[PDB]
């Protein structure tokens, strides 16, 4: 399964199976036991703008 969204860089370590914070507590939820992989990369060149 593939779920996709964009977050900030200073909060990606809120994403681990068993965590805290408003993207772990609210807005999304992992289980505690986990199989898959998580991949993230900055897109400030394209997704940020003046």
């Amino acid at each position: 399964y593939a779920d996709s969204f964009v977050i900030r860089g200073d909060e990606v370590r809120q994403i681990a199976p068993g965590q805290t914070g408003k993207i772990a507590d609210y807005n999304y939820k992992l289980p505690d036991d986990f199989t898959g992989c998580v991949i993230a990369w900055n897109s400030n060149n394209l997704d940020s703008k003046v």
């Epitope: 200073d10 805290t20 914070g21 408003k22 507590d25 609210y26």
Partner: antibody, heavy 117, light 109 residues
Framework: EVQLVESGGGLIQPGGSLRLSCAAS????????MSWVRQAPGKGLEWVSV???????YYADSVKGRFTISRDNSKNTLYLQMNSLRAEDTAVYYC???????????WGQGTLVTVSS | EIVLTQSPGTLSLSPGERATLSCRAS???????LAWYQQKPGQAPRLLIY???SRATGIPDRFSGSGSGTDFTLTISRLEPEDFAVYYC?????????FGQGTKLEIKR
């Protein structure tokens, strides 16, 4: 929206433990964040701890492993249980209603935490 | 680094004139994620303005905060004498919420 009375603090010898209480009124105390902030009597304002409406808590690094917050939304009473008291945690403390961005918009009255001496 | 540092630290003036002050960080902050506070001595400290843009209710409009990044100011358009207190800057951009040390506002009778 009249709320946030504080009580409980005072003279206490070091090494003890104390649960403070900040009761509010006219507000759904469950469905928001609250916080704690200290005020050293010669110095500025320093944040202590936060709770979430879901219920997650965070603390300052100095008070790590020492201080436990809790609440009873059946009686609308925040509980700051501080333990292993040292003689530099001698500030006056404030319960603070919290919004959103973690602005502390509504403020308590204050109560003195004074270490044994 | 995130440390709020007041510009002057105190101001002694005469009422009826435009008051202006700033608070300086120790790095550039993410955009306008800071606030101001005032403290009445012997009382509870109170809200001043969120986001350095607009202030909340219960506050009149004689006051204006501006700036971006390291510098971030606050301007009171006319000195009300009863507003003499200790005034704080507060941030919420960084992962802790750090504070400053305050600014004293008074008059020289």
């Amino acid at each position: 929206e009249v709320q946030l009375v504080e009580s409980g603090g005072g003279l206490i010898q070091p090494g003890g433990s104390l649960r403070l209480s900040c009761a509010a009124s006219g507000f759904t105390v469950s469905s928001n964040y609250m916080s704690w902030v200290r005020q050293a009597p010669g110095k500025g304002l320093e944040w202590v701890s936060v709770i979430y409406s879901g219920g997650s808590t965070y603390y300052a690094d100095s008070v790590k492993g020492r201080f436990t917050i809790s609440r009873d939304n059946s009686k609308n009473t925040l509980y700051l249980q501080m333990n292993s008291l040292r003689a530099e945690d001698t500030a006056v403390y404030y319960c603070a209603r919290d919004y959103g961005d973690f602005y502390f918009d509504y403020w308590g009255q204050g109560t003195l935490v004074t270490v044994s001496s | 680094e995130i440390v709020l540092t007041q510009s002057p630290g105190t101001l002694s003036l005469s009422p009826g004139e435009r008051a202006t002050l700033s608070c300086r960080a120790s790095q550039s902050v993410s955009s306008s994620y800071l606030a101001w506070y005032q403290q009445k001595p012997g009382q509870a400290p109170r809200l001043l303005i969120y986001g350095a843009s607009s202030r909340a209710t219960g506050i009149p409009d004689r006051f204006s905060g501006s700036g971006s990044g390291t510098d971030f100011t606050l301007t009171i358009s006319r000195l009300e004498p009863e507003d003499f207190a200790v005034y704080y800057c507060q941030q919420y951009g960084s992962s802790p919420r750090t504070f400053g040390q305050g600014t004293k506002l008074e008059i020289k009778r």
